[PDB]
Design a protein around this ligand. Structure first.
Ligand code: XXH
Ligand code: XXH
Lengths: 269, 269
Protein backbone atom coordinates (compact mmCIF):
# COMPACT_ATOMS: atom_id res chain seq x y z
CA UNK A 1 0.00 0.00 0.00
CA UNK A 2 3.10 2.27 0.24
CA UNK A 3 6.15 2.56 -2.03
CA UNK A 4 9.07 0.14 -1.85
CA UNK A 5 11.40 3.14 -1.39
CA UNK A 6 9.23 3.93 1.63
CA UNK A 7 9.29 0.36 2.89
CA UNK A 8 13.10 0.33 2.66
CA UNK A 9 13.25 3.59 4.64
CA UNK A 10 10.83 2.26 7.28
CA UNK A 11 12.85 -0.97 7.71
CA UNK A 12 16.17 0.90 7.75
CA UNK A 13 15.12 3.29 10.49
CA UNK A 14 13.36 0.61 12.50
CA UNK A 15 16.78 -1.10 12.64
CA UNK A 16 18.46 2.17 13.62
CA UNK A 17 15.89 2.43 16.41
CA UNK A 18 16.60 -1.15 17.61
CA UNK A 19 20.33 -0.34 17.70
CA UNK A 20 19.46 2.15 20.42
CA UNK A 21 18.74 -0.95 22.53
CA UNK A 22 21.15 -3.59 21.15
CA UNK A 23 24.16 -1.60 19.93
CA UNK A 24 26.75 -2.86 22.46
CA UNK A 25 28.31 -0.30 24.86
CA UNK A 26 27.06 3.28 25.22
CA UNK A 27 30.48 3.77 26.86
CA UNK A 28 31.96 3.38 23.35
CA UNK A 29 34.24 5.94 21.67
CA UNK A 30 33.16 8.11 18.74
CA UNK A 31 34.32 6.82 15.34
CA UNK A 32 33.78 3.05 15.62
CA UNK A 33 31.39 1.16 13.30
CA UNK A 34 27.83 0.50 14.57
CA UNK A 35 26.95 -3.13 15.37
CA UNK A 36 24.11 -4.95 17.15
CA UNK A 37 23.75 -8.15 19.09
CA UNK A 38 21.33 -10.89 17.97
CA UNK A 39 20.84 -9.60 14.42
CA UNK A 40 18.98 -6.45 15.56
CA UNK A 41 20.46 -4.08 12.93
CA UNK A 42 21.78 -6.01 9.85
CA UNK A 43 21.03 -3.19 7.34
CA UNK A 44 22.77 -0.68 9.60
CA UNK A 45 25.75 -3.06 9.78
CA UNK A 46 25.79 -3.49 5.98
CA UNK A 47 26.36 0.30 5.60
CA UNK A 48 29.39 2.47 6.46
CA UNK A 49 27.78 3.49 9.77
CA UNK A 50 29.69 4.90 12.74
CA UNK A 51 28.91 6.61 16.04
CA UNK A 52 29.40 10.36 16.44
CA UNK A 53 28.05 10.76 19.96
CA UNK A 54 26.57 8.35 22.55
CA UNK A 55 24.52 9.37 25.59
CA UNK A 56 23.10 7.39 28.53
CA UNK A 57 20.86 8.38 31.49
CA UNK A 58 21.72 11.86 30.21
CA UNK A 59 19.79 14.83 31.62
CA UNK A 60 16.80 15.01 33.94
CA UNK A 61 14.83 12.36 32.02
CA UNK A 62 17.63 9.80 31.77
CA UNK A 63 17.70 9.94 27.97
CA UNK A 64 19.70 7.40 25.97
CA UNK A 65 20.77 6.97 22.36
CA UNK A 66 23.29 7.78 19.65
CA UNK A 67 24.13 10.14 16.81
CA UNK A 68 25.35 8.28 13.73
CA UNK A 69 27.06 9.12 10.49
CA UNK A 70 25.93 6.84 7.71
CA UNK A 71 28.12 7.40 4.66
CA UNK A 72 26.39 4.76 2.51
CA UNK A 73 22.78 5.92 2.74
CA UNK A 74 23.93 9.56 3.13
CA UNK A 75 22.23 10.19 6.47
CA UNK A 76 22.82 11.84 9.82
CA UNK A 77 20.74 9.90 12.37
CA UNK A 78 19.76 10.79 15.95
CA UNK A 79 18.36 7.64 17.53
CA UNK A 80 16.56 7.51 20.91
CA UNK A 81 16.34 4.34 22.98
CA UNK A 82 13.07 3.65 24.72
CA UNK A 83 12.66 2.21 28.21
CA UNK A 84 14.86 -0.67 29.40
CA UNK A 85 11.59 -2.08 30.83
CA UNK A 86 8.49 -1.25 28.73
CA UNK A 87 5.96 -3.13 30.93
CA UNK A 88 6.97 -0.89 33.87
CA UNK A 89 7.17 2.33 31.86
CA UNK A 90 3.64 1.59 30.53
CA UNK A 91 2.15 0.93 33.99
CA UNK A 92 4.05 3.87 35.49
CA UNK A 93 2.96 6.15 32.60
CA UNK A 94 1.98 9.64 33.80
CA UNK A 95 -0.75 11.40 31.75
CA UNK A 96 -0.20 15.07 32.72
CA UNK A 97 0.02 17.76 30.05
CA UNK A 98 2.34 20.81 29.94
CA UNK A 99 2.25 24.01 27.85
CA UNK A 100 4.79 24.11 25.01
CA UNK A 101 4.49 27.64 23.61
CA UNK A 102 8.15 27.76 22.56
CA UNK A 103 7.70 24.89 20.06
CA UNK A 104 4.02 25.43 19.48
CA UNK A 105 1.62 28.40 19.29
CA UNK A 106 -1.05 26.99 21.63
CA UNK A 107 0.07 23.45 22.32
CA UNK A 108 0.23 21.18 25.32
CA UNK A 109 2.56 18.20 25.24
CA UNK A 110 3.37 15.39 27.68
CA UNK A 111 5.24 16.88 30.67
CA UNK A 112 7.66 13.93 30.95
CA UNK A 113 8.47 13.66 27.23
CA UNK A 114 8.73 17.44 26.86
CA UNK A 115 10.95 17.71 29.97
CA UNK A 116 13.31 14.81 29.29
CA UNK A 117 14.11 16.29 25.90
CA UNK A 118 14.20 19.98 26.97
CA UNK A 119 16.90 18.98 29.45
CA UNK A 120 19.21 17.81 26.61
CA UNK A 121 17.99 19.83 23.60
CA UNK A 122 21.00 22.17 23.81
CA UNK A 123 23.87 19.67 23.72
CA UNK A 124 22.12 17.46 21.15
CA UNK A 125 21.17 20.43 18.95
CA UNK A 126 24.88 21.28 18.83
CA UNK A 127 26.00 17.74 17.97
CA UNK A 128 23.62 17.66 14.98
CA UNK A 129 24.61 21.12 13.70
CA UNK A 130 28.28 20.08 13.63
CA UNK A 131 27.36 17.06 11.47
CA UNK A 132 24.99 19.06 9.24
CA UNK A 133 27.94 21.41 8.67
CA UNK A 134 30.37 18.57 7.98
CA UNK A 135 27.83 16.92 5.64
CA UNK A 136 25.55 19.58 4.03
CA UNK A 137 24.05 17.09 1.52
CA UNK A 138 23.39 14.42 4.19
CA UNK A 139 19.78 13.80 5.24
CA UNK A 140 19.16 14.63 8.90
CA UNK A 141 16.79 12.03 10.34
CA UNK A 142 15.34 11.57 13.84
CA UNK A 143 14.11 8.13 14.91
CA UNK A 144 13.02 6.03 17.88
CA UNK A 145 10.74 3.33 19.25
CA UNK A 146 8.37 3.44 22.25
CA UNK A 147 9.78 6.20 24.48
CA UNK A 148 12.40 6.96 21.80
CA UNK A 149 9.65 7.49 19.27
CA UNK A 150 8.05 10.26 21.31
CA UNK A 151 11.44 11.83 22.11
CA UNK A 152 12.37 11.90 18.41
CA UNK A 153 8.98 13.42 17.54
CA UNK A 154 9.48 16.17 20.17
CA UNK A 155 13.08 16.87 19.13
CA UNK A 156 11.93 16.99 15.50
CA UNK A 157 9.21 19.57 16.12
CA UNK A 158 11.53 21.57 18.40
CA UNK A 159 14.58 21.66 16.11
CA UNK A 160 12.99 22.04 12.65
CA UNK A 161 12.93 25.35 10.74
CA UNK A 162 16.66 26.14 10.93
CA UNK A 163 17.74 25.70 7.29
CA UNK A 164 18.05 21.90 7.33
CA UNK A 165 15.18 19.43 6.96
CA UNK A 166 14.66 16.97 9.82
CA UNK A 167 12.64 13.83 9.03
CA UNK A 168 11.16 11.77 11.86
CA UNK A 169 10.58 8.03 11.84
CA UNK A 170 8.91 6.87 15.05
CA UNK A 171 8.02 3.30 15.93
CA UNK A 172 5.22 2.53 18.35
CA UNK A 173 5.49 6.04 19.78
CA UNK A 174 2.84 7.09 22.29
CA UNK A 175 0.57 10.16 21.86
CA UNK A 176 2.81 13.13 22.59
CA UNK A 177 0.39 16.03 23.23
CA UNK A 178 -2.97 17.75 22.63
CA UNK A 179 -5.13 18.48 19.57
CA UNK A 180 -3.19 21.58 18.60
CA UNK A 181 0.22 19.82 18.83
CA UNK A 182 -1.28 17.07 16.67
CA UNK A 183 -2.06 19.72 14.01
CA UNK A 184 1.37 21.36 14.33
CA UNK A 185 2.92 17.91 13.85
CA UNK A 186 0.65 17.33 10.82
CA UNK A 187 1.39 20.52 8.86
CA UNK A 188 4.84 21.55 10.14
CA UNK A 189 7.35 22.37 7.41
CA UNK A 190 11.00 21.37 7.43
CA UNK A 191 10.46 17.63 7.17
CA UNK A 192 8.13 14.69 7.15
CA UNK A 193 7.20 12.64 10.19
CA UNK A 194 6.44 9.02 9.42
CA UNK A 195 4.54 7.70 12.45
CA UNK A 196 4.68 3.94 12.19
CA UNK A 197 2.38 1.73 14.27
CA UNK A 198 1.88 -2.03 14.45
CA UNK A 199 -1.50 -3.82 14.70
CA UNK A 200 -3.05 -3.61 18.19
CA UNK A 201 0.14 -2.22 19.76
CA UNK A 202 -0.83 -0.72 23.13
CA UNK A 203 1.62 2.17 23.23
CA UNK A 204 0.27 4.33 20.36
CA UNK A 205 -2.99 4.05 22.31
CA UNK A 206 -1.56 5.97 25.32
CA UNK A 207 -1.98 8.42 26.98
CA UNK A 208 -5.65 8.06 26.05
CA UNK A 209 -7.59 10.66 24.03
CA UNK A 210 -9.76 10.74 27.17
CA UNK A 211 -6.86 12.66 28.75
CA UNK A 212 -6.46 15.41 26.14
CA UNK A 213 -3.94 13.63 23.96
CA UNK A 214 -4.40 13.53 20.21
CA UNK A 215 -2.52 11.86 17.34
CA UNK A 216 -0.74 13.66 14.51
CA UNK A 217 -1.67 12.66 10.97
CA UNK A 218 -0.95 10.45 9.11
CA UNK A 219 -0.25 7.03 10.61
CA UNK A 220 1.50 4.18 8.80
CA UNK A 221 -0.14 1.07 10.17
CA UNK A 222 1.45 -2.39 9.87
CA UNK A 223 -1.30 -5.03 9.53
CA UNK A 224 0.89 -8.16 9.58
CA UNK A 225 1.09 -10.06 12.85
CA UNK A 226 3.64 -10.29 15.64
CA UNK A 227 6.79 -12.21 14.59
CA UNK A 228 5.57 -12.04 10.99
CA UNK A 229 7.91 -10.51 8.38
CA UNK A 230 6.66 -7.18 7.01
CA UNK A 231 6.05 -6.47 3.30
CA UNK A 232 5.09 -3.15 1.70
CA UNK A 233 1.56 -4.56 1.22
CA UNK A 234 1.10 -4.91 4.98
CA UNK A 235 1.46 -1.17 5.63
CA UNK A 236 -1.58 1.09 5.21
CA UNK A 237 -1.48 4.91 5.22
CA UNK A 238 -4.21 6.45 7.39
CA UNK A 239 -5.08 10.15 6.94
CA UNK A 240 -6.86 12.23 9.57
CA UNK A 241 -6.01 13.44 13.06
CA UNK A 242 -7.07 10.68 15.49
CA UNK A 243 -8.12 8.42 12.63
CA UNK A 244 -9.57 4.97 13.22
CA UNK A 245 -9.18 1.81 11.14
CA UNK A 246 -5.52 1.56 12.13
CA UNK A 247 -3.90 1.24 15.55
CA UNK A 248 -6.81 3.24 17.00
CA UNK A 249 -9.47 0.51 17.21
CA UNK A 250 -11.87 -0.30 20.11
CA UNK A 251 -10.44 -3.87 20.32
CA UNK A 252 -8.16 -5.44 22.98
CA UNK A 253 -4.55 -4.07 22.91
CA UNK A 254 -1.28 -5.98 23.23
CA UNK A 255 2.34 -5.57 24.41
CA UNK A 256 4.11 -8.12 22.14
CA UNK A 257 2.93 -6.20 19.01
CA UNK A 258 4.89 -3.25 20.36
CA UNK A 259 8.16 -5.24 20.24
CA UNK A 260 7.88 -6.35 16.64
CA UNK A 261 8.46 -3.45 14.19
CA UNK A 262 9.71 -5.01 10.89
CA UNK A 263 11.74 -7.21 13.23
CA UNK A 264 12.49 -7.56 16.93
CA UNK A 265 12.64 -4.16 18.68
CA UNK A 266 12.66 -2.78 22.24
CA UNK A 267 14.40 -5.91 23.54
CA UNK A 268 17.53 -7.81 22.55
CA UNK A 269 18.08 -11.52 21.99
CA UNK B 1 16.37 -30.81 1.39
CA UNK B 2 13.59 -31.80 3.79
CA UNK B 3 10.03 -32.57 2.68
CA UNK B 4 7.25 -29.96 3.11
CA UNK B 5 5.61 -32.40 5.53
CA UNK B 6 8.68 -32.93 7.70
CA UNK B 7 9.14 -29.14 7.68
CA UNK B 8 5.57 -28.69 8.96
CA UNK B 9 6.27 -31.29 11.64
CA UNK B 10 9.43 -29.45 12.67
CA UNK B 11 7.60 -26.11 12.90
CA UNK B 12 4.72 -27.67 14.85
CA UNK B 13 6.93 -29.20 17.54
CA UNK B 14 9.04 -26.06 17.73
CA UNK B 15 5.83 -24.34 18.81
CA UNK B 16 4.84 -27.06 21.28
CA UNK B 17 8.38 -26.50 22.59
CA UNK B 18 7.91 -22.73 22.90
CA UNK B 19 4.44 -23.37 24.39
CA UNK B 20 6.34 -24.90 27.30
CA UNK B 21 7.66 -21.39 28.09
CA UNK B 22 4.90 -19.05 26.89
CA UNK B 23 1.78 -21.13 27.52
CA UNK B 24 -0.88 -20.16 30.05
CA UNK B 25 -0.15 -23.42 31.95
CA UNK B 26 -0.42 -24.42 35.65
CA UNK B 27 -3.74 -23.37 37.04
CA UNK B 28 -4.92 -24.40 33.58
CA UNK B 29 -7.17 -27.45 34.25
CA UNK B 30 -7.44 -30.56 32.04
CA UNK B 31 -9.39 -29.89 28.83
CA UNK B 32 -8.16 -26.28 28.55
CA UNK B 33 -7.40 -25.10 25.01
CA UNK B 34 -3.62 -24.55 24.64
CA UNK B 35 -2.74 -20.95 23.73
CA UNK B 36 0.45 -18.87 23.86
CA UNK B 37 1.10 -15.19 24.37
CA UNK B 38 2.98 -13.09 21.79
CA UNK B 39 2.14 -15.31 18.80
CA UNK B 40 4.53 -17.99 20.17
CA UNK B 41 2.47 -21.02 19.01
CA UNK B 42 -0.24 -20.21 16.40
CA UNK B 43 -0.11 -23.72 14.86
CA UNK B 44 -0.70 -25.23 18.29
CA UNK B 45 -3.63 -22.79 18.74
CA UNK B 46 -5.09 -23.59 15.28
CA UNK B 47 -5.28 -27.26 16.28
CA UNK B 48 -7.82 -28.87 18.58
CA UNK B 49 -5.19 -29.08 21.30
CA UNK B 50 -5.78 -29.37 25.04
CA UNK B 51 -3.79 -29.90 28.28
CA UNK B 52 -3.92 -33.42 29.72
CA UNK B 53 -1.44 -32.71 32.51
CA UNK B 54 0.57 -29.57 33.31
CA UNK B 55 3.57 -29.65 35.65
CA UNK B 56 5.86 -27.00 37.15
CA UNK B 57 8.87 -27.53 39.45
CA UNK B 58 8.22 -31.28 39.64
CA UNK B 59 10.78 -33.35 41.54
CA UNK B 60 14.47 -32.76 42.25
CA UNK B 61 14.94 -31.40 38.72
CA UNK B 62 12.56 -28.40 38.95
CA UNK B 63 11.09 -30.01 35.81
CA UNK B 64 8.44 -27.94 34.03
CA UNK B 65 6.24 -28.80 31.04
CA UNK B 66 2.88 -30.08 29.84
CA UNK B 67 1.16 -33.17 28.41
CA UNK B 68 -1.11 -32.25 25.49
CA UNK B 69 -3.75 -34.03 23.42
CA UNK B 70 -4.09 -32.98 19.78
CA UNK B 71 -7.27 -34.30 18.14
CA UNK B 72 -6.44 -32.37 14.95
CA UNK B 73 -2.99 -33.88 14.41
CA UNK B 74 -3.70 -37.07 16.39
CA UNK B 75 -0.91 -36.58 18.91
CA UNK B 76 -0.06 -37.13 22.53
CA UNK B 77 2.62 -34.50 23.07
CA UNK B 78 4.79 -34.31 26.18
CA UNK B 79 6.47 -30.94 25.89
CA UNK B 80 9.42 -30.32 28.22
CA UNK B 81 10.38 -26.75 29.15
CA UNK B 82 13.94 -25.44 29.23
CA UNK B 83 15.36 -22.96 31.74
CA UNK B 84 13.66 -19.72 32.90
CA UNK B 85 16.95 -17.89 32.24
CA UNK B 86 19.34 -19.59 29.83
CA UNK B 87 22.56 -17.58 30.36
CA UNK B 88 22.64 -18.54 34.08
CA UNK B 89 21.65 -22.15 33.28
CA UNK B 90 24.69 -22.22 30.92
CA UNK B 91 27.29 -20.65 33.25
CA UNK B 92 26.27 -23.09 36.01
CA UNK B 93 26.03 -26.19 33.78
CA UNK B 94 27.48 -29.20 35.59
CA UNK B 95 29.40 -31.63 33.33
CA UNK B 96 29.31 -34.72 35.63
CA UNK B 97 27.98 -38.03 34.26
CA UNK B 98 26.19 -40.92 36.00
CA UNK B 99 25.48 -44.50 34.87
CA UNK B 100 22.25 -45.31 33.01
CA UNK B 101 22.10 -49.06 32.40
CA UNK B 102 18.31 -48.87 32.88
CA UNK B 103 18.21 -47.29 29.39
CA UNK B 104 21.20 -48.97 27.72
CA UNK B 105 24.18 -51.12 28.74
CA UNK B 106 27.44 -49.24 29.36
CA UNK B 107 25.57 -45.96 28.93
CA UNK B 108 26.23 -42.82 30.89
CA UNK B 109 24.23 -39.60 30.65
CA UNK B 110 24.74 -36.13 32.09
CA UNK B 111 24.14 -36.54 35.83
CA UNK B 112 21.50 -33.83 36.19
CA UNK B 113 19.33 -34.39 33.11
CA UNK B 114 19.12 -38.09 34.02
CA UNK B 115 18.44 -37.40 37.71
CA UNK B 116 15.78 -34.77 36.89
CA UNK B 117 13.95 -37.18 34.58
CA UNK B 118 14.21 -40.09 37.03
CA UNK B 119 12.64 -38.03 39.83
CA UNK B 120 9.57 -37.63 37.58
CA UNK B 121 9.79 -40.80 35.43
CA UNK B 122 7.15 -42.98 37.12
CA UNK B 123 4.60 -40.14 37.34
CA UNK B 124 4.86 -39.02 33.69
CA UNK B 125 4.97 -42.59 32.36
CA UNK B 126 1.56 -43.18 34.05
CA UNK B 127 0.01 -40.07 32.45
CA UNK B 128 1.42 -41.02 29.04
CA UNK B 129 0.18 -44.59 29.57
CA UNK B 130 -3.38 -43.39 30.36
CA UNK B 131 -3.50 -41.32 27.18
CA UNK B 132 -2.01 -44.10 25.00
CA UNK B 133 -4.91 -46.22 26.27
CA UNK B 134 -7.69 -43.71 25.47
CA UNK B 135 -6.12 -42.81 22.14
CA UNK B 136 -4.05 -45.81 20.93
CA UNK B 137 -4.53 -44.46 17.40
CA UNK B 138 -2.56 -41.32 18.37
CA UNK B 139 1.16 -40.86 17.75
CA UNK B 140 3.08 -40.25 20.98
CA UNK B 141 5.56 -37.39 20.56
CA UNK B 142 8.08 -36.01 23.07
CA UNK B 143 9.41 -32.52 22.35
CA UNK B 144 11.45 -29.81 24.02
CA UNK B 145 13.73 -26.82 23.62
CA UNK B 146 17.16 -26.39 25.19
CA UNK B 147 17.09 -28.13 28.60
CA UNK B 148 13.56 -29.18 27.61
CA UNK B 149 15.03 -30.82 24.53
CA UNK B 150 17.45 -32.73 26.76
CA UNK B 151 14.82 -34.13 29.08
CA UNK B 152 12.79 -35.24 26.04
CA UNK B 153 15.63 -37.23 24.44
CA UNK B 154 16.38 -38.93 27.80
CA UNK B 155 12.69 -39.41 28.64
CA UNK B 156 11.91 -40.97 25.26
CA UNK B 157 15.06 -43.11 25.35
CA UNK B 158 13.86 -44.54 28.67
CA UNK B 159 10.17 -44.98 27.85
CA UNK B 160 10.45 -46.55 24.37
CA UNK B 161 9.78 -50.26 23.78
CA UNK B 162 6.72 -50.53 26.04
CA UNK B 163 4.19 -51.01 23.20
CA UNK B 164 3.90 -47.58 21.56
CA UNK B 165 6.46 -45.66 19.53
CA UNK B 166 7.80 -42.38 20.91
CA UNK B 167 9.10 -39.73 18.50
CA UNK B 168 11.42 -37.01 19.76
CA UNK B 169 11.79 -33.53 18.38
CA UNK B 170 14.42 -31.43 20.14
CA UNK B 171 15.41 -27.79 19.70
CA UNK B 172 18.95 -26.69 20.43
CA UNK B 173 19.30 -29.56 22.90
CA UNK B 174 22.71 -30.07 24.54
CA UNK B 175 24.67 -33.32 24.37
CA UNK B 176 22.97 -35.89 26.60
CA UNK B 177 25.69 -38.39 27.43
CA UNK B 178 28.67 -40.53 26.48
CA UNK B 179 29.34 -42.15 23.09
CA UNK B 180 27.51 -45.40 23.95
CA UNK B 181 24.34 -43.40 24.48
CA UNK B 182 24.77 -41.40 21.27
CA UNK B 183 25.02 -44.62 19.24
CA UNK B 184 21.98 -45.97 21.10
CA UNK B 185 19.73 -42.96 20.41
CA UNK B 186 20.86 -43.11 16.76
CA UNK B 187 19.51 -46.68 16.33
CA UNK B 188 16.86 -47.32 19.03
CA UNK B 189 13.71 -48.30 17.11
CA UNK B 190 10.13 -47.66 18.28
CA UNK B 191 10.43 -43.93 17.64
CA UNK B 192 12.56 -41.60 15.52
CA UNK B 193 14.60 -38.80 17.08
CA UNK B 194 14.82 -35.57 15.16
CA UNK B 195 17.64 -33.54 16.65
CA UNK B 196 17.47 -29.98 15.42
CA UNK B 197 20.11 -27.26 15.54
CA UNK B 198 20.23 -23.63 14.44
CA UNK B 199 23.43 -22.15 12.94
CA UNK B 200 26.09 -21.34 15.57
CA UNK B 201 23.86 -22.12 18.55
CA UNK B 202 25.91 -22.50 21.78
CA UNK B 203 23.75 -25.11 23.54
CA UNK B 204 24.12 -28.15 21.20
CA UNK B 205 27.88 -27.70 21.80
CA UNK B 206 27.71 -28.23 25.55
CA UNK B 207 28.66 -30.24 27.44
CA UNK B 208 31.83 -30.40 25.31
CA UNK B 209 33.19 -33.54 23.57
CA UNK B 210 36.29 -33.30 25.79
CA UNK B 211 34.13 -33.97 28.88
CA UNK B 212 33.02 -37.40 27.64
CA UNK B 213 30.07 -36.23 25.48
CA UNK B 214 28.96 -37.16 21.98
CA UNK B 215 26.04 -36.10 19.70
CA UNK B 216 23.56 -38.50 18.04
CA UNK B 217 22.87 -38.90 14.29
CA UNK B 218 21.30 -37.41 12.32
CA UNK B 219 21.31 -33.66 12.93
CA UNK B 220 18.93 -31.33 11.13
CA UNK B 221 20.80 -28.04 10.85
CA UNK B 222 19.11 -24.69 10.08
CA UNK B 223 21.22 -22.42 7.83
CA UNK B 224 19.02 -19.31 8.00
CA UNK B 225 19.90 -16.45 10.34
CA UNK B 226 18.57 -15.42 13.71
CA UNK B 227 15.21 -13.71 13.22
CA UNK B 228 15.05 -14.97 9.61
CA UNK B 229 12.24 -17.14 8.30
CA UNK B 230 13.11 -20.79 7.72
CA UNK B 231 12.28 -22.44 4.40
CA UNK B 232 12.70 -26.09 3.37
CA UNK B 233 16.04 -25.16 1.76
CA UNK B 234 17.57 -23.73 4.94
CA UNK B 235 17.54 -27.13 6.68
CA UNK B 236 20.29 -29.73 6.12
CA UNK B 237 20.48 -33.40 7.16
CA UNK B 238 23.89 -34.11 8.75
CA UNK B 239 24.85 -37.79 9.06
CA UNK B 240 27.39 -39.31 11.48
CA UNK B 241 27.92 -39.48 15.25
CA UNK B 242 29.71 -36.23 16.13
CA UNK B 243 29.73 -34.97 12.54
CA UNK B 244 31.03 -31.46 11.94
CA UNK B 245 29.65 -29.01 9.38
CA UNK B 246 26.29 -28.51 11.13
CA UNK B 247 26.25 -26.85 14.56
CA UNK B 248 29.46 -28.59 15.72
CA UNK B 249 31.87 -26.18 13.94
CA UNK B 250 34.88 -24.17 15.22
CA UNK B 251 33.46 -20.66 15.48
CA UNK B 252 32.12 -18.47 18.29
CA UNK B 253 28.83 -19.82 19.67
CA UNK B 254 25.74 -17.63 20.04
CA UNK B 255 22.97 -17.42 22.63
CA UNK B 256 20.57 -15.49 20.30
CA UNK B 257 20.87 -18.30 17.67
CA UNK B 258 19.46 -20.51 20.45
CA UNK B 259 16.33 -18.40 20.65
CA UNK B 260 15.35 -18.62 16.97
CA UNK B 261 14.08 -22.10 15.99
CA UNK B 262 11.50 -21.36 13.21
CA UNK B 263 10.34 -18.58 15.51
CA UNK B 264 11.00 -17.18 18.97
CA UNK B 265 11.62 -19.96 21.48
CA UNK B 266 12.97 -20.00 25.05
CA UNK B 267 11.86 -16.40 25.59
CA UNK B 268 8.42 -14.77 25.39
CA UNK B 269 7.48 -11.39 23.87
O1 XXH C 1 15.31 1.59 33.24
C1 XXH C 1 14.29 1.69 32.57
C2 XXH C 1 13.70 3.01 32.31
C3 XXH C 1 12.33 3.21 32.49
C4 XXH C 1 11.77 4.46 32.25
C5 XXH C 1 12.58 5.52 31.84
N1 XXH C 1 12.04 6.80 31.59
O2 XXH C 1 10.84 6.95 31.36
O3 XXH C 1 12.76 7.78 31.59
C6 XXH C 1 13.95 5.31 31.66
C7 XXH C 1 14.51 4.06 31.90
O1 XXH D 1 15.17 -21.00 36.69
C1 XXH D 1 15.89 -21.45 35.82
C2 XXH D 1 16.40 -22.83 35.94
C3 XXH D 1 17.73 -23.10 35.68
C4 XXH D 1 18.20 -24.40 35.78
C5 XXH D 1 17.34 -25.42 36.14
N1 XXH D 1 17.82 -26.73 36.26
O2 XXH D 1 18.20 -27.36 35.30
O3 XXH D 1 17.85 -27.25 37.36
C6 XXH D 1 16.01 -25.14 36.40
C7 XXH D 1 15.54 -23.84 36.30
Amino acid sequence: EVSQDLFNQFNLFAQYSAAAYCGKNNDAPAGTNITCTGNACPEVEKADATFLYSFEDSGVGDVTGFLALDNTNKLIVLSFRGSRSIENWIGNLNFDLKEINDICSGCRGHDGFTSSWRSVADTLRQKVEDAVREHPDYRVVFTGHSLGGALATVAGADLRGNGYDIDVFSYGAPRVGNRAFAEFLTVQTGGTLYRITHTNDIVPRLPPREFGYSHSSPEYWIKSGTLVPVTRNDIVKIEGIDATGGNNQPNIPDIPAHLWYFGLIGTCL
